[PDB]
Write an enzyme that holds these catalytic residues in place. Sequence first.
Site, PDB file in Angstrom:
ATOM      1  CD  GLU A 119      -2.577  -1.487   0.005  1.00 35.45           C
ATOM      2  OE1 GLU A 119      -2.835  -0.540  -0.761  1.00 35.45           O
ATOM      3  OE2 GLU A 119      -2.906  -2.662  -0.236  1.00 35.45           O
ATOM      4  CE1 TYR A 162      -4.314  -7.579  -7.761  1.00 36.99           C
ATOM      5  CE2 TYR A 162      -2.730  -6.560  -6.282  1.00 36.99           C
ATOM      6  CZ  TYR A 162      -4.029  -6.708  -6.735  1.00 36.99           C
ATOM      7  OH  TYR A 162      -5.059  -5.977  -6.164  1.00 36.99           O
TER       8      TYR A 162
HETATM    9  C1  DJ3 Z   1      -6.345  -6.726 -14.897  1.00 34.74           C
HETATM   10  C2  DJ3 Z   1      -7.805  -7.120 -14.689  1.00 34.74           C
HETATM   11  C3  DJ3 Z   1      -8.673  -5.904 -14.492  1.00 34.74           C
HETATM   12  C4  DJ3 Z   1      -9.759  -6.261 -13.478  1.00 34.74           C
HETATM   13  C5  DJ3 Z   1      -9.545  -5.558 -12.153  1.00 34.74           C
HETATM   14  C6  DJ3 Z   1      -9.929  -4.109 -12.253  1.00 34.74           C
HETATM   15  C7  DJ3 Z   1     -10.094  -3.224 -11.025  1.00 34.74           C
HETATM   16  C8  DJ3 Z   1      -9.807  -3.665  -9.600  1.00 34.74           C
HETATM   17  C9  DJ3 Z   1     -10.951  -3.498  -8.596  1.00 34.74           C
HETATM   18  C10 DJ3 Z   1     -10.678  -3.514  -7.063  1.00 34.74           C
HETATM   19  C11 DJ3 Z   1      -9.227  -3.573  -6.521  1.00 34.74           C
HETATM   20  C12 DJ3 Z   1      -8.848  -3.526  -5.017  1.00 34.74           C
HETATM   21  C13 DJ3 Z   1      -7.381  -3.694  -4.630  1.00 34.74           C
HETATM   22  C14 DJ3 Z   1      -6.888  -3.624  -3.186  1.00 34.74           C
HETATM   23  C15 DJ3 Z   1      -5.398  -3.693  -2.861  1.00 34.74           C
HETATM   24  O1  DJ3 Z   1      -4.325  -3.902  -3.902  1.00 34.74           O
HETATM   25  C16 DJ3 Z   1      -4.877  -4.970  -2.974  1.00 34.74           C
HETATM   26  C17 DJ3 Z   1      -4.084  -5.456  -1.725  1.00 34.74           C
HETATM   27  C18 DJ3 Z   1      -4.941  -6.467  -0.947  1.00 34.74           C
HETATM   28  C19 DJ3 Z   1      -5.297  -7.788  -1.719  1.00 34.74           C
HETATM   29  C20 DJ3 Z   1      -5.457  -8.975  -0.697  1.00 34.74           C
HETATM   30  O2  DJ3 Z   1      -4.391  -9.370  -0.246  1.00 34.74           O
HETATM   31  O3  DJ3 Z   1      -6.558  -9.335  -0.338  1.00 34.74           O
HETATM   32 ZN    ZN Z   2      -2.444  -2.945  -5.067  1.00 36.70          ZN
END
Ligand code: DJ3
Ligand code: ZN
Length: 608
Positions: free
Chosen positions: A294, A381
Amino acid sequence: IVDTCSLASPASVCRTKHLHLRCSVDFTRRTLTGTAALTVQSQEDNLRSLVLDTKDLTIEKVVINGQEVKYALGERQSYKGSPMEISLPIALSKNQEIVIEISFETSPKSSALQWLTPEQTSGKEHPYLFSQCQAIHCRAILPCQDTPSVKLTYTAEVSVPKELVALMSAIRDGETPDPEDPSRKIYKFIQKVPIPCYLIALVVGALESRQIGPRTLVWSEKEQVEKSAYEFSETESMLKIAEDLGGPYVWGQYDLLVLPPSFPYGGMENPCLTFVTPTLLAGDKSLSNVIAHEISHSWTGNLVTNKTWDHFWLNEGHTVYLERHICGRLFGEKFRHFNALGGWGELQNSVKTFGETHPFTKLVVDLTDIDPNVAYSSVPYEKGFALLFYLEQLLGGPEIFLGFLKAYVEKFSYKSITTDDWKDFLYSYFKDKVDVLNQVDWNAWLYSPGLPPIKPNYDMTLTNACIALSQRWITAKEDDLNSFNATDLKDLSSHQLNEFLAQTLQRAPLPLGHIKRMQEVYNFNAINNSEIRFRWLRLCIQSKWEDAIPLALKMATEQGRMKFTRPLFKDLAAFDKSHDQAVRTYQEHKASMHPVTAMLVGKDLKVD
Ligand SMILES: CCCCC/C=C\C\C=C/C=C/C=C/[C@@H]1O[C@H]1CCCC(=O)O
Ligand SMILES: [Zn+2]
Ligand SMILES: [Yb+3]
Ligand SMILES: [Yb+3]
């Protein structure tokens, strides 16, 4: 380049420069009411209308130049919401700015929000509210151009019951009694750095704070403050490393908020106030890579931003790359490689789940008519990280590639970019190694599904013991189980125990007698580390141990991090002995889950 997830006017037509939000949080009605005043700059001649995104918003009026103007809400377009067209009273010239003040109220079912009753909190006496706007839920809080291609500053005044505290993704700017209602307080906020609207965030609840570094307070309900201050004590050291790698930290404060257990993610990089899951509270700081992640978004994501969600890997891949460099500085390059190799295993798992030809395993993904929450996975990721790690090794090593990363952040700070912008700058920075870059299979890496065409090189030092012990268990027969003993773990760190379980889970099921023996000699049921417990319970359920059913149901429902909750429910639904109970448990809890998590678990279980 078009943002197919937004119904609003694109940045080529008009751009929001500033939001001034005045609102009131009504826990009796589960609504946010107020006014959103948008300062909008025309990007074209003779501009007479514009369109904003909305989702389940009630609009009262729209005011420009002190008079109400005409507007129209179009029909709903599924998860995208309803477009709101506003008729401007006077045609605008290019670069002219006006202020549009919209009076609105949210719905209790807003997909951006979770409203919690007192019983769902730690203290049991006060309610709680938190937001989660990424990717396209800001439109479920207020009317906006809900696209990361537009960046705006914001100021806010939030009225809440006087017993509670409001925080936002912004610098705190004072509090006062509400002059319209003495039972309430107004909290003020300023965000002077331009941000995409998915980084607007709000929490309201019975919050207390403790200082843990020169620019960091940790916020939580009183019951969690002490454990949180210890768990995240590495934060300032991580910030100093991140500044060395990325350049200046421009956001002023770096505060942390520990949410209630239903928070859907490990963390969310809300500027000035990172949100984190309480499942990080392992007692030993061993899940602190989430904080490093983060922190890193303060450069990769929040300064340099993906222009559309098709290019999300730019945000997450570069952030994982910086994350693993922070933890490598802290704990050593062998540890960076260990975590890198673990991430490749997670990429293998995601690709194996989706299928090797699935469109969501492409690095760049076409989200036309795809809900981003449905497409979300570890692919951006870990395939993104793997590409950058591969390029690091191709282009001369981590010191050289970190020089690129810092120059990349500087080049695109305060901007929103595409994969082609990134690639063009890669070729510009490395102009003397273009022949080497032209050896890369760019079409495979960026646009083809499945595993990447080339695997990076990984140091194995810290992984070998995990693999060796996993293989002992997989190849063990009944007459070998006696040889296992608690001493097998004495030289393994928590990270290595987690990887031993990940290795073994990849080969699940194991025989039931093996799993019973593992509990007998390793007592994994006693470990509260959420990552270890998650993998252990998945291994037990996939190996058909009925004893683990109540444990898995408890973990799936007593917290709501989607990384844990969704696979636990899926495993329980796949085990015939627990299927009916998994479904009944979801149905009983769904009304009090986070709205997005409830939707996804329902899809996962094929429940309606
Ligand atoms: C490349 C595919 C595109 C589809 C995804 C598009 C948008 C993403 C929508 C919500 C993202 C939230 C992310 C939260 C934090 O980076 C995450 C760290 C916590 C993840 C975990 O360990 O549960
Ligand atoms: Zn992230
Ligand atoms: Yb004109
Ligand atoms: Yb001030």
